[PDB]
Amino acid sequence: VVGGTEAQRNSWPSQISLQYRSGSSWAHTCGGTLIRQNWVMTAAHCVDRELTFRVVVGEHNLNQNDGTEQYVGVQKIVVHPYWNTDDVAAGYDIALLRLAQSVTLNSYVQLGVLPRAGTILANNSPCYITGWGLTRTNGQLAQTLQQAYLPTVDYAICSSSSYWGSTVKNSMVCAGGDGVRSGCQGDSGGPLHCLVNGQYAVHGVTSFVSRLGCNVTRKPTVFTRVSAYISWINNVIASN
Ligand SMILES: *[C@](=O)([C]([N]C(=O)[C]1[C][C][C]N1C(=O)[C]([N]C(=O)C1=[C][C]=C(C(=O)[N][C]C([O])=O)[C]=[C]1)[C]([C])[C])[C]([C])[C])C(F)(F)F
Ligand SMILES: [Ca+2]
Secondary structure (H helix, E strand, O other): OEOOEEOOOOOOOOEEEEEEEOOOOEEEEEEEEEEEOOEEEEOHHHHOOOOOEEEEEOOOEOOOOOOOOEEEEEEEEEEOOOOOOOOHHHOOOOEEEEEOOOOOOOOOOOOOOOOOOOOOOOOOOOEEEEEOOEOOOOOOEOOEOEEEEOOEEOHHHHHOOOOOOOOOOOOEEEEOOOOOOEOOOOOOOOEEEEEEOOEEEEEEEEEEOEOOEOOEOOEOEEEEEHHHOHHHHHHHHHHO
């Protein structure tokens, strides 16, 4: 997250770090949100790959012992059936990951709240991204959870030619696009927390930003619109 600030240890307790085996040690590669105690929501393209995955909940500094961490393996990856690795811009960039045992909840570990199916935000909605991704284009990972105020840019505006054109669709959400603050690599798969009727809920999963760079004016960070995939989520979880 470029242009962020570091978050307080207990603000965003559904935040997770998704990591791989890197071999001898582990390496953050994306974010995720805790949505059940044995289930996490992240982006299909962060689990595209043949690596071993773990998840870390109660994580504030990726280095440094926090005193609050729980580390749990991933048992089972369900990618959207229509995701195609070649095409982030088609959408479906969404995956659920079954953990090997359920985490315990506390003040640093909590379940993400999901929007009602179908909800769409007004323009210029209040929303935060959070993550450990690069703090500059072609920079380095934060060591501490960062967060950045990114309000929404609605589908017609984000849709216009001066912004994403065509490449956005309506199964997606745009937020930011001011030139200063944005998502960046290593924030992929994590939450976009929006304020709606006094409670924060997770309305996006971080997907993509532009090839010219992370914080570019008029190319907002783009995310999977959670509210288009409610029924898919609940059907996976039901099934396993
Ligand atoms: C994540 O932290 C990171 N996301 C990405 O890395 C994603 C993964 C796939 C490519 N990603 C991009 O964000 C890249 N985007 C593009 O290269 C790109 C932009 C736009 C389009 C498009 O307009 N197609 C339209 C059409 O009409 O079909 C395609 C491709 C950028 C340059 C890096 C953060 C950036 C969120 C992680 F890094 F892990 F992946
Ligand atoms: Ca730590």
